[PDB]
Design an enzyme around this catalytic site. Structure first.
Site, PDB file in Angstrom:
ATOM      1  N   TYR A  33       0.864  -1.174   0.000  1.00 35.92           N
ATOM      2  CA  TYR A  33       0.000   0.000   0.000  1.00 35.92           C
ATOM      3  C   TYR A  33       0.893   1.214   0.000  1.00 35.92           C
ATOM      4  O   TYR A  33       1.797   1.321   0.830  1.00 35.92           O
ATOM      5  CB  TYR A  33      -0.887   0.034   1.243  1.00 35.92           C
ATOM      6  CG  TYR A  33      -1.666   1.334   1.434  1.00 35.92           C
ATOM      7  CD1 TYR A  33      -2.559   1.774   0.467  1.00 35.92           C
ATOM      8  CD2 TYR A  33      -1.511   2.112   2.576  1.00 35.92           C
ATOM      9  CE1 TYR A  33      -3.293   2.948   0.635  1.00 35.92           C
ATOM     10  CE2 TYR A  33      -2.234   3.301   2.744  1.00 35.92           C
ATOM     11  CZ  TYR A  33      -3.116   3.706   1.761  1.00 35.92           C
ATOM     12  OH  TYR A  33      -3.835   4.869   1.929  1.00 35.92           O
ATOM     13  N   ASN A  35       0.526   5.408   0.132  1.00 34.13           N
ATOM     14  CA  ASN A  35      -0.271   6.611   0.290  1.00 34.13           C
ATOM     15  C   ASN A  35       0.598   7.752  -0.202  1.00 34.13           C
ATOM     16  O   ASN A  35       1.497   8.208   0.498  1.00 34.13           O
ATOM     17  CB  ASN A  35      -0.638   6.763   1.773  1.00 34.13           C
ATOM     18  CG  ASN A  35      -1.645   7.858   2.028  1.00 34.13           C
ATOM     19  OD1 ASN A  35      -2.089   8.548   1.113  1.00 34.13           O
ATOM     20  ND2 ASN A  35      -2.036   8.001   3.287  1.00 34.13           N
ATOM     21  N   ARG A  79     -13.416   8.519  -4.836  1.00 38.04           N
ATOM     22  CA  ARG A  79     -14.435   8.652  -3.803  1.00 38.04           C
ATOM     23  C   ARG A  79     -14.171   9.882  -2.954  1.00 38.04           C
ATOM     24  O   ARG A  79     -13.074  10.445  -2.959  1.00 38.04           O
ATOM     25  CB  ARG A  79     -14.437   7.415  -2.882  1.00 38.04           C
ATOM     26  CG  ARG A  79     -13.133   7.257  -2.089  1.00 38.04           C
ATOM     27  CD  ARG A  79     -12.889   5.813  -1.663  1.00 38.04           C
ATOM     28  NE  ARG A  79     -11.449   5.560  -1.567  1.00 38.04           N
ATOM     29  CZ  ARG A  79     -10.651   5.389  -2.616  1.00 38.04           C
ATOM     30  NH1 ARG A  79     -11.164   5.394  -3.848  1.00 38.04           N
ATOM     31  NH2 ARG A  79      -9.343   5.199  -2.440  1.00 38.04           N
ATOM     32  N   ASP A  81     -14.174  10.465   1.071  1.00 39.85           N
ATOM     33  CA  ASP A  81     -14.240   9.841   2.385  1.00 39.85           C
ATOM     34  C   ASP A  81     -14.669  10.896   3.382  1.00 39.85           C
ATOM     35  O   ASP A  81     -14.185  12.024   3.336  1.00 39.85           O
ATOM     36  CB  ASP A  81     -12.861   9.343   2.840  1.00 39.85           C
ATOM     37  CG  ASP A  81     -12.364   8.146   2.061  1.00 39.85           C
ATOM     38  OD1 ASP A  81     -13.119   7.530   1.277  1.00 39.85           O
ATOM     39  OD2 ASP A  81     -11.181   7.808   2.272  1.00 39.85           O
ATOM     40  N   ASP A 112      -2.883   5.050  -3.193  1.00 42.76           N
ATOM     41  CA  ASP A 112      -3.851   6.124  -2.964  1.00 42.76           C
ATOM     42  C   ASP A 112      -3.244   7.459  -3.270  1.00 42.76           C
ATOM     43  O   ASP A 112      -2.093   7.713  -2.948  1.00 42.76           O
ATOM     44  CB  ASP A 112      -4.305   6.170  -1.502  1.00 42.76           C
ATOM     45  CG  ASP A 112      -5.583   5.428  -1.245  1.00 42.76           C
ATOM     46  OD1 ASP A 112      -6.290   5.014  -2.197  1.00 42.76           O
ATOM     47  OD2 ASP A 112      -5.905   5.276  -0.041  1.00 42.76           O
TER      48      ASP A 112
HETATM   49  O1  LIG Z   1     -10.247   6.237   3.564  1.00 47.74           O
HETATM   50  C1  LIG Z   1      -8.934   5.812   3.777  1.00 47.74           C
HETATM   51  C2  LIG Z   1      -8.684   5.442   5.174  1.00 47.74           C
HETATM   52  C3  LIG Z   1      -7.337   4.814   5.381  1.00 47.74           C
HETATM   53  C4  LIG Z   1      -6.647   4.115   4.239  1.00 47.74           C
HETATM   54  C5  LIG Z   1      -7.159   4.421   2.885  1.00 47.74           C
HETATM   55  C6  LIG Z   1      -8.612   4.638   2.965  1.00 47.74           C
HETATM   56  O2  LIG Z   1      -8.998   4.975   1.693  1.00 47.74           O
END
Ligand SMILES: O[C@H]1CCCC[C@@H]1O
Ligand SMILES: O[C@H]1CCCC[C@@H]1O
Lengths: 118, 118
Positions: A33, A35, A79, A81, A112
């Site tokens: 993963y 970020n 998306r 969040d 991400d």
């Molecule tokens: O919304 C977030 C929260 C933590 C990891 C990625 C996720 O997309």
């Protein structure tokens, strides 16, 4: 919806569980993963620890996915969040793009890109 | 170097200690840290927890400060951090601007802007 897109949408639905043990089931051992632009979490266990750590400080209160597609086998999904900071009770909306690589139905890579504008 | 700039430079020197308990001594109770654009850590205890959590995954191996100045009472300082990810042994260089507010010799606000380009 391709089979891989289906799996990614299920995973997105599952985010509001705020449960790293549940979420990690979607991942292969050989996974990562990232970020962006932070260094990646390498391997399934690191991904699980990253999620578990995140859920000690934030609740994902809602996920509103507004786009999904694929190109060259990779699944792209976008998306907003709704994130609530647990030590303050304050909530934030943030857009994010997730890019997923799947191998035999399991996530082998996840990148991400959160909105990093002020 | 103003008295506040001197304090900030001492703090920068202390980063390579990788010791949250040591570093928190520079902070007032009424303080905050914001790693832009993430939500802030509110209060001294949250700042300590943030640093302590960081030091479980990264070592600050070196800090090379290349600018310091002040404007409107706030201290601005820029550096390259050499960060080593403890679970992988891999190292990364990243530039960062820190903006500091001090009240009576203690840090009452700290904003970081890391380089977020790929
Ligand atoms: O919304 C977030 C929260 C933590 C990891 C990625 C996720 O997309
Ligand atoms: O300067 C950085 C170095 C790593 C921990 C937090 C600080 O903001």
């Amino acid at each position: 919806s391709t089979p891989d897109e289906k799996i990614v949408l299920e995973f997105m639905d599952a985010l509001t569980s705020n449960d790293a043990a549940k979420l990690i089931d979607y991942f292969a051992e050989d996974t990562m993963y990232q970020n962006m632009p932070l260094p990646p979490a390498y391997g399934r266990d690191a991904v699980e620890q990253t999620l578990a750590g995140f859920f000690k400080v934030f609740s994902i209160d809602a996920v509103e996915t507004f786009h999904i597609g694929s190109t060259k086998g990779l699944v792209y999904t976008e998306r907003v969040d709704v994130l609530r900071a647990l030590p303050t009770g304050k909530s934030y909306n943030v857009s994010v793009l997730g890019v997923f690589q799947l191998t035999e139905g399991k996530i082998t890579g996840w990148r991400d890109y959160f909105d990093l504008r002020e």
